[model samples]
Target chain A: SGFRKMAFPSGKVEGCMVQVTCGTTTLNGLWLDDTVYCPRHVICTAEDMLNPNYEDLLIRKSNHSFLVQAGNVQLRVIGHSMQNCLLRLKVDTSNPKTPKYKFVRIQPGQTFSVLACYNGSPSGVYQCAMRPNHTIKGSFLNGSCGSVGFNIDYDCVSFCYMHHMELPTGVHAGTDLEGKFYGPFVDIQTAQAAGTDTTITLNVLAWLYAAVINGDRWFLNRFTTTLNDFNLVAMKYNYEPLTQDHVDILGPLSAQTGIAVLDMCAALKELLQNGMNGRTILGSTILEDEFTPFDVVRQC
Target chain B: SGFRKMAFPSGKVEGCMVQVTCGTTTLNGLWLDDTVYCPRHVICTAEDMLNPNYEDLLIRKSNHSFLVQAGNVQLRVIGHSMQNCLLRLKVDTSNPKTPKYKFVRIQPGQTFSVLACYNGSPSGVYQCAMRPNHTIKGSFLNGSCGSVGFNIDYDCVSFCYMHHMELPTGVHAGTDLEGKFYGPFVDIQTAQAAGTDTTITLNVLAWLYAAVINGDRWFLNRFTTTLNDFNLVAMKYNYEPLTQDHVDILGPLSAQTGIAVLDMCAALKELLQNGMNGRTILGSTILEDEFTPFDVVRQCS
Candidate 1:
């Protein structure tokens, strides 16, 4: 340790991580004038900051370690499991490039961007899940399988309600900086579907619904009439299509997230009978066993 | 010509167009019990129907025309000008294959479809235009050209607001069968701006604005943060970015179509100053000369 080192008479190093050495071995370091460098494995806790020579009071590494939580953290994701729960997070930085500002276009394969500065401790913010629905059709089932998605990211970033980047032990989750939360968006992928991938995002769904509801002639002539985009039109804007099994499976997660269910095993026969647009168009509904694989859910 | 000499005791020829012959010329024919077939040049007008020998109506046609409008018309288009006008048309058959029901898959190029039966006079209904915006970029202009589309389509179907197959002498433009009209859709194409052709439909704009306003992390990651869809993000949901010249050019059309203008000259310099998300990102607004070719407009007319 550079134990009780002399203060920087010139204030040359303004509180930054610097390298230093202890009596017998090399160590991690910092400078706010007089310094404290700790063993690589242990943490320089609040106590160490107060007393310097508290090497005897150093804490060891553990599962929930936030060794050094400061400087250059361009991005971070906090608790996002529960649907309506709000998580508080404040982005404390004056840098113009906070990661989202600067964008780089591609020369096809090449990528570039303006570097950003992310300085200081992280803040907490609320999280709201964007409820989206998807019906996947593949060879396995010969029927498209509908999914009532579940997102349970156990990582502390998704559970902790404080600025601390560690898992919260005992509190009901709620923390977000803004009055509201944007989608800690979920993107899922599955095989059997093809052709430049399609997104049934809420945005897309809303767009399609608007076209269908508002009856934009251009839209119908292209997607529905000319192109016959069966899959695109197959999806419903609301939760009415969900079958009994789908409702039961997503019952809990739905309540927590304020989302309703989609027909997990929506077979073609039933979809045809219920029909969309006053007529039965080709749609999907598969058995539960035929479709499995999503973030987290109650197995049954 | 197959002049009307007799009537079908049975309704065998239920008013169908059939090949027939005339005295010296091979004439077009029809079968409605007692029939009349005349030289291929004239139309079978009301006079011809009333009197079999009125083959004199084989009137030589000129510009605006509807040669024949009848059965097997799975699709049709009617007067689509004047946004608020309604036209009347009635589809007479009960065929499931009205061009919209059956979809054919491709072995890539092979085309197939179930034939539909369309028998009767067309009805009238109201028409509304779904306004859309586009910013196109190619070698023509280093900047993308924004366009507030116009759809004139001089065809009589688009001008005539009546069920009569021929262009109307005068109607203030209002006709369609249903209460409203489906798109007499306008599909305008341009080049350069690539990848799949993107749509900046109001629906899409609304969706994007909702995500941005509602703050969907997923959308930001995929569209904005990850893929850097500059063009997609560059488009404004509203008509705010339009420049002065753009506003003036589209002023009349916009007023007529219930639409506003887009920045036809929306270049980067000014876009940066105004900024979409409080910061200027890559966007487009090219000079008017960089763009041309839309449907009918005042043309200083």
Candidate 2:
């Protein structure tokens, strides 16, 4: 009987099986010291790591995981099961290349909060599961399918609070911030289903502007529908198409607010034009063949 | 001759056989004054005008055509035979999107300088051909294939002369600017053969620096070979490798003047690094596995 001494360096040989000999005989199952080799064979082959079939296994194995719940903090989700599954919110203001994600996890017989508003939010894809675990050790989806996912977005509008004239000697009330919201609000599943994309990010502000000061509810309705309907037209003649009612409202507002109405009109006009021209607006035609009423109006 | 009055506008009436009536009888082979028509038929039939094969006939029929020739100058070409048919020179420094072209007429067995360049250059594909005719009236390439073609480049070093032994004299000799030229030098065919690109302009200046200062003959010899050999290592760690002898030559140049050899090394290193990093210098590997010794050495070099 003999005792043999052996040493293996700290690389390459780990997780590998080797045969070693001491003069007369060779032995198997020798490994680098301090390295533990699991006898587990991957049974889940032939399926992509990202395939939802592994979702249960992944969640169970995860160091940390969270169930997507509904609420109105910075993030919110709305819509039914299939609808919810169709949406993903991508937060990218911080780092576009590595934008974090938030996915909508739908449940049976549940209605989700579709309109999510992230005001004063950190830029990244907001997810129902907020633990940042995007570090993948191996190939795409080959390693840990990170816990985080992406899902929806909306920008808040600014406003103020105030009361005038009622003040006397004691104290005067301060203006309160009355913020509004807009959207490049995306509905990924709806977009994919419609064979198109979500709302034009540029036009979101214009839609919000039209909604707030103009108080055009009809326009707002159209804008919301257009946000998810990829083939929908969101603008006409670089502006939201207004009606006689809109004109009446605008006239009263313009008369009441000295220069504010003018600024609003100008700003809205410019935003819409930029949105349309930049192709972020849902429908802006350019070529002669595709030329339409807006093009003719612009030419005039 | 019978006199018959007829009205024909200054246009459109030409080239058609005319029949005129004076009264009850019609006259044959008679025409309005100053109107004449020829019976020649167009040999070229209707086909896609945009096809390049009809380049010659299209140009002859059109009012204008151009050529793209070789050399740093805006226009030049030298070649013969159907050879003249082989070339065009285009200049597009001002507007590469719509480059202007000039063409060359080849005579006998001449070697046309088909390649061309523009110094103080501009971005965009510098085509040898430059002419507004590249504009097709309706669609792309619906015009003449103007003559001349592109196919090499070199930049002469800049220099100026100033001083000498004038310090000891009562009146010192005046300083004259002396400059040596460098490159935009290119070897397209060789690069293509070697399965590499000609170069990203950055290395051209570094090459000039190495050529002028290091003056290492062996390095130069290798460099010359490397420039065209498709299989040759395109960049030595983002730079052309230098011999110990290069250090030797740079030493004296560094000591003699305020200029430093370190500067040359630093500049060469920087240029090469930029070139390699940009993947414009030929040999930057795209795939991780393709990363090679040259890549490792440049990190150290």
Candidate 3:
């Protein structure tokens, strides 16, 4: 079912705030709203190269069984498409650097994508990573071009995904360096023609951060994000109030970075429905550049 | 007369109070004594390559001089023997990028060398630009015997002069960068024999700076370098303190960047005498390198 309404940056998705806290005061949350629809759909490449070659790459680089959150809810990748030859997707994963035991790799021309769906649980982290191939001769340009290092810094998806899968009930969640964080995209307006503000809506959902201080826990229940405003919000951040809870993890839980993904999705909803501007938000320095749509879709 | 005593990095010079800034707010004042005598020296090379076959090729190629200042007052050259060398002193007229002024070339092998002196003045930024000859192909070093840059950090000499030159009688009577602040050394007590802490007396001489600062009136002052103390107290600070009646040549002058040659000579005398220890005053940091007597004196009597 579609969310009823949502807040701006951190309001409510379903009915929880996007917050998960753990260890030394680190917070983690996620938001998924219509405003999240950034138009920058293309992978960057030198001009005068490949034109609109994204579809084939998408199919070859994506996986269907991939799942991200493990809280009472789950946010899955349910949509993806090639916009003007550039591939775009709905990501839901537990970090990409060391993907949780499962990851898809594209062999050139092929690409990957993602989208969201209403499933069992509705909390998580989702994003994408891609690898491109070149057909030019080893010595064509500067003899060193054909070598490696070219594609290293060019891992050009302006967005990122949550690397954790579960949300703890307490204020703090996840481990250091691992959790339901937003995409790599620091500035969202640059990525979409849609806009930078989240329109207001009704029926807000908030996963207020239940902060645990010195053996005591308190819920930051004032924050909220609603669904009627989902189209206006960016990500789901209502189920949890923190994402950094691990110095280290153990067990089946030991298999993962032990990040609380569901909690972030919950927080995303909360932030959108009732969060303040850059003034009251947590971890706002995430993005740094302007977004341009389908800008780099071809290779030269 | 010999200085009371001279010291080098020799343990004797350690912990000595070198900075005499009267006020309490001097930030670098304490850093004065902590730094040991910089034991850096530059290596020189012969103009003509030794090999007959390479001589023509060496002279044909342009020589480049990379100037670097490592902070030592005593200027001496090493590396390759300069059979016939010329000395051309450059005084910066103004532009830092392109220095303007005169050049007096010395005859070949004139036993040439260099030393930087300061009189606690701000105008000491002038650098000595040297070359084999002023042609496009001429440079400070020829490719073969390699000329190395100076390695020293601080000059103990200036510290000594600036400390003693200041007195209650108002700056030992000089006004600017050209003032007669320091010396020309004279060996005393076979001072060279005991260790590096031998007395080297400075010839009292008035300088262009003194005239420039104190109106054409330049006075002479001699300093007797010893093992420890600067006998500046001996000269009575060059005659006597000036009375208010004496004409103040240049109004309260702001220190300049380029110091006069005379001032540097005095600063060196004070530092050399007190800058030594029982063996050597300059100590090396990276390796077992040192500044031998040969490094300072081309031909000490």
Candidate 4:
């Protein structure tokens, strides 16, 4: 589902939640412009390529990477620094010789994705200057900065990191790792239609979630089509309580890690039955661009 | 919270939800009467005994038991038939000599609690007449009807069963295993207070769950004390979003099987924040006695 957001991102369904950051502006799509947009304010990529196209590639080859400067004595990094990493990325520039990827979990000969742009050599074992708190142990894997581009398998065995991602505010990208993406259908609605109530909002949120988060393009198109029918049919003729057809329309219950079907159904049924005068009907938090004003962002 | 409902069920905070079935009526509270009442419409017990007071006792010793007769060929019994049981309780009267607790899982001698009242010897390997479908296997262990009172350990090894309990709608108890409970505080609101919305209802439901389901009498008293404070404090002094105090107030995060603390907190926070104009506030299905005009008591209700 998140991929559809990363790929199409033209205000079709996903783009509305974000804005481009090219010319000190957001709220509008940036087609062909050199700018970054986000769901997490980081760089992610769309695939004309297949699933393994990214999975099997080394970190150096994949769009997953972060910039590393020589001067910063200490760096507190998070998983969002990579396109789709979920653990702490460790770098130790302390050793000017062959610097290590501290606490790293790569099997002796295995390889993993989690690329960085600190090494002079565009592709292999490299160095950087980032130290962690003494308390941070097993969680922050330390090893040799093997794969300079793709998942490096020098001497550090590894695998893809999977966990929640949190990033520091402001775009965290630059020359070494340019933020890349696609979209901007060019013409569409930036405003999300508020549902009758929270339940409906949650119900539609499931559809959007499946479409965007699970990368179910089929559901994306299916839900959009149903949405098309919704306007034409005056929104009547709903399955009322999300029936088998709704389940089928949600696409195959792929083994992707996401929401449960029961929850999705229940949320939809609730959304259908519960509608207020748009009072608790959430639009901004769950669906809108959150673009009113960019004030000082605190870590809290 | 529920045991408070099960035990001190005398129209106490727990008592308001049920009534006894000595006669045909079920409105007011019944105390010291030879009648069976319920939250699940069956019989459960209180404890002058310690925690393992019931757990360690044999099914023959504990209050967990049900009635079985010779005539019935096919019986669809549920776990609620046994006190504090969560899995299915299978019986096979089909065996005239050594009837089995088919699909039973006593550790070959682990001695689980699941007592019944069909065997006349008063205890030990005996007989009964209940048969299960051909389809129900593995779940229904086939063992001798052991612990006739508390949990018995005959040839069938066992442990306490746990899971959701759903029972057929009426008072499913009788002579073989008579159920008697006492209640009638005579002074309390039978009608539960409808919350401003579903969230508050669920929040309170969590407290009730912790109190009854997890048997946290401390929380039961604590919530009751808070409820006392609610009327006096204008309901103004809520922990507001359920702070650490609220978490600590929840007794301890013991290894009991129940709801998650986070969910409980989230529900409370949502409740404190969201109150509709009473439209979505829940009552009967959650906190009330569900006493309306009785209809065709299908399993649906």
Candidate 5:
């Protein structure tokens, strides 16, 4: 091995497995001591600076990997224009072309928090990125400045914690956090503890409990109302029924951000039936035949 | 003429057509206004304030719509507890007995600015609501909050100059008021205008925009990164190889509200590529598998 030798299954190969396989013609290359390879497959560990995913790492709107468990784990980032934007560790503002300064943009010396919780594949390194979608951009000059790291294993134990590091030996029955984890999708219960950890938990239960997701406006009259109340209704009363062309005359700018009146209506109906909305309005019509996609309505 | 003495279109009158007269008997029994219906065919005019969208003629959160155009409009609800919590027209605490809040929640007093410009649909009445999920439990409230409404006809000879109700005609179509006209979804310039006056104009726009339709992740993500990023990472790890489990996990949360890591990664990648980071080390390497969706790994899911 270039720096040091660590063997798995703990043993030396004394047979024809002449594991100097680095440059050998007839040997399993991985078992060799003098092979040159890229760091991609190193299965990152601590104490290795080259191990970028270790020791109080600052996730600068980038992707990363690490082991974690179920439950809440916190992360801290400096805030600039940090409104109550949903703090996400696994954000993928994929538009590298879009200005991070506009979205996921943070302020100097300000801290923000993210909450995350997941159940399956509990040992993978969960990834995320911060952007400025709902939040504000940092101010001019060093505006997009911030730092981030995990506080893993925050309020979870007695169920999934274990000391052992290897699989089979450390992995407990059920969805516990123990063993040699290999993943890019880690839970929050087992993040490496830091001095000032801001956690994001993997909430499997909360997720399952909700009905009519908050952003889903797939139904009608719930989130939106008719413009028939106005003279300039998009659904016009032309000599003939107004087609898409007629509707087009009235811009499609409902609830932007992929949310639709129908989604809101469905959610509202659920809320009403579930007693979420206190008093109900009788004789109100729900769905409008004039349905449009959030995209077609909201301008991009 | 119909009930209101307004001339009825041939379509509105039953058996009124010269050819194939039929169905007049049913129309006369209800005493329908010249064959027009009360709830369906009727249209409202400004004179009909008593039957406005809200109970009162005076503007209020529960009743008023923001006509956003030239400058910024503020929808403020008071309460310090309104950090990341859901905001609508009403309250939302844990109580299924009678959920007091049902419409999309607007932060008690949070402010979101709108200045994009398009010819017609650009200026209209707008309502604001905040949700943790992109798709679930949007709350509604009825409170007496403040608002500002004005006209926004760039070409109209009659123009007003109020911070709250300014038109986008000369509102720097190039500067602050540029981008998606109606809050990033409706390109005001491209879409049709909602109405002549600003109040109805903006309100119609908001109502139309809120109307949901069917679409996949592809159409959804292009509008925002959060939706796209979450799916990409889940795809990378083979979170759900065959089953709809992954979709089940992400669909509600995203449409409802919540951030997924992969989607976040994609969003970050977009931000990074846009040139905002101070330092650059290693780029995103989260994608090696094809099962991953495009938006998720677009940056590095």
Candidate 6:
């Protein structure tokens, strides 16, 4: 209900201090806090703090599930709730699509830890969803359940969740699970007005990688027009990084696009290192120079 | 008067104990002696055993001269004689032919040492000849002179003579100064008869280098036939050192070739390391396969 406030019966929605543990050592207290009209709201509980298994529990009261803990390397996700629910965790990376597993079995009052999601050396995000196992024979059908995503190197979590669903004002309730992760976009008008085509090609690659990871058809379709617009001009010149004067546009542009600045930078760096020629990106025989985006949606 | 007996008129031609000194330390006593019938024989004296500069002056009573002392790396060639004769010295090496210079001007009763023949890091032979500088514009035109050759690692001296001039049965006499050093010779027939090709190839290169150093046309010509004979058979196989049984041939063969065993090893080692395929000894193009010893001899000797 409107992200069950951290305090009992609601007052200030103070963020929780989630004490992270890796193996035997206590890593650190991760501060999880979000603004009042944030997409996926979470609340903290004293029982979670008292339970030794969970240093501090984050109860996702809002239907808009958010990322709790971000990890890039190997980490174990345990079922700490006092219920026999099924947990579904999947890795979302540039490599492969996540697998849909049977409901992870966990009984009440049972301390459990499952190998949640693992990735290679590259850093990427992971998400998980949970529901009662009795409903779908250990499988999750289209139903309402709390979902969350996280990353290790950067905080792409707090700013996710794309679809905007209507809710009663001031009344906490269930959230629609159909919303997707909001990825970054390039501000074409602002970039053109500012006379800089620097971030256009790289940011488009970042959005494409995000679409590839998320398997979002709508997002892929939406960027096809921007890719076409950028490729039209990018063909004439070898695109490069923008000057400092134009760099100030990337912050607001990254915010508008919904992709984290660090995440976008990582994706662009990966693309450049792998020889980002225009032909491969656009899937066309013409255009030999590098640093040009392609209509990933139309071509692929 | 065969080699003029080292004694006055009748006694043993006793060899001299040449006292060698480098700065202050007396290194050792070198024996400088040749036999009664030997060419250019020398003998020692008791008074020479007393002098500090000499500690042993092996005053040669006969005109036949000899090396007062032999040195490898760095040593002085002092004119220890009480006569006013020019002591001429020269360095002979595999690198280049020796040069003519001041018949080492030394006055009577004078002691001197010149930084004599010097070679590079690689070890080979070096020799020096002595004579009176005043005789002929500081040049030993054709008269006989006593000469000595030495090596840093082994002896290439004590065994060198140039001309093939035969001596009378009992005459103490002079040798031709123009004669090159007569180095050791490997018996080609003996090596061939022994059925070992190991020393043939290596010794040919050794003799080639020696001939190149001496500018000895006669010696080079003599070996040319041997080279041709060996090269003909060597072409049939990839030339390489004997694995083991044939290794025994390198010892005596190296001895006869007059090149130091180590020096020969270094040379053959260098050739093999560079993939010794079909090149002639002097490093040229014409001779692709073996049996082409004429170019090597004709080019240099």
TM-score of each: 0.17, 0.16, 0.15, 0.21, 0.16, 0.15
Interface RMSD of each: 43.9, 44.2, 37.7, 29.4, 35.8, 54.4
Give the per-residue lDDT digits (tens) of candidate 2, residues A25-139: 2222111121111101111233331233333433343211211111221112121111111112111112212212222332111111101111111111100110011110110
Give per-residue CA lDDT, model 3, range B1-301, as digits (tens): 0010011111111111111111121100101211211101111122221222333332432212212122222111111111111111111121122111112222111111111112111100001111112101011111101111111113321222111111211111111111111221111111111112111122111122322232222222264233223334323322222222211221122133133333333443443344323221111111111112221121110
Per-residue accuracy of model 5 over A1-300 as CA lDDT, tens digit each = 000000011001111011111111111101112211111112223333234442233233222232111112211212211111111222211212221111122211112211111121111111121111111111101100111111112121111111111111112111112121122212122543212211111111011111113232322243453323221322132111223333333223321234343333333334334532323221112111111122122211
Separate clash counts for every candidate: 62, 74, 162, 68, 136, 13
Superposed by TM-score, candidate 2 places the C-alpha of residue A296 at a distance from the truth, in angstroms, of 23
User: Candidate 1 regions off by >4 Å?
Assistant: A1-238, A241-300, B1-117, B121-245, B249-301
User: What is the per-residue lDDT of model 2 for residues B94-166, given as tens digits with 9 covering 90 to 100?
Assistant: 2222212222222111111111101111101111111111110110011101111221111111111111111
RMSD of 6: 38.5
Stretches of candidate 6 exceeding 4 Å from the true structure: A1-300, B1-141, B154-200, B205-301
User: How good is model 1 by TM-score?
Assistant: 0.17
What's model 2's lDDT at B13?
11
Pick by TM-score: 4 or 6, better one: 4
For chain B alone, what TM-score does every candidate structure achieve against the true structure?
A: 0.18, 0.20, 0.16, 0.20, 0.16, 0.21
Candidate 5 lDDT tens digits, B152-258: 12211111100111122212111011111122212122332222211111111111111111111221123244434534533443232222343343343344334
Poorly placed runs, candidate 4 (over 4 Å)? A1-161, A167-300, B1-161, B168-229, B232-301
Range of the 10 consecutive residues with the lowest summed lDDT in candidate 3 chain B: B135-144
The weakest ten consecutive residues by lDDT in model 2 chain B span: B1-10
In candidate 5, the second chain superimposes onto the true chain B with a TM-score of: 0.16
Residue B83, candidate 1: how far off, in angstroms? Answer: 27
Residues A18-72 of candidate 1: C-alpha lDDT, one tens digit per residue: 2222222222222121222222222333344333332232233222222222243
lDDT of each: 0.20, 0.20, 0.20, 0.22, 0.19, 0.23
What is the TM-score ranking, best to worst? 4, 1, 2, 5, 6, 3
State the local distance difference test value for candidate 5.
Answer: 0.19
Docking class of 3: incorrect
